[PDB]
Amino acid sequence: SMQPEEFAAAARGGFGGDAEKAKAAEAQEAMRQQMEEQRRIMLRAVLTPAAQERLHRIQLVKADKAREVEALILQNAQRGRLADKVDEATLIELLQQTSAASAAKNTPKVTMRRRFSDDDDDF
Numbered sequence: 001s002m003q004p005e006e007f008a009a010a011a012r013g014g015f016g017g018d019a020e021k022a023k024a025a026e027a028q029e030a031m032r033q034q035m036e037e038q039r040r041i042m043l044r045a046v047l048t049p050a051a052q053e054r055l056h057r058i059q060l061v062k063a064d065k066a067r068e069v070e071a072l073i074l075q076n077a078q079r080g081r082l083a084d085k086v087d088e089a090t091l092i093e094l095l096q097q098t099s100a101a102s103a104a105k106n107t108p109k110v111t112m113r114r115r116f117s118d119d120d121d122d123f
Contacts, residue, residue, distance in 0.1 A: 051089040079122045
């Protein structure tokens with residue numbers, strides 16, 4: 001399973017027709033891009049990639065949410081994301097989304113410093 005296939009993907013010819021092909025062919029990627037689907041909800045969930053998407057987007061709106069996410073990844077990713085247990089992105093994006101809104105694992109009021117991205121501690 002080792003062959004020169006870097007320049008693969010004919011990317012079609014934008015003929016414009018393919019009324020039948022584009023029907024399912026396009027729909028395949030369409031849904032994915034449309035977001036909201038078990039496909040990405042699971043695959044894209046554990047997948048390492050798909051981070052730049054939300055990273056760039058969320059960044060545009062909340063710059064802080066970006067500069068703060070690029071600071072950790074510097075060591076997190078460099079150390080080795082949780083590609084074994086579970087995607088780190090979904091973890092950092094899930095804990096950061098409600099770092100103050102709730103966080104911790106008992107009650108956001110007397111948890112004594114809510115928890116945080118465990119991966120940050122290379123663990």
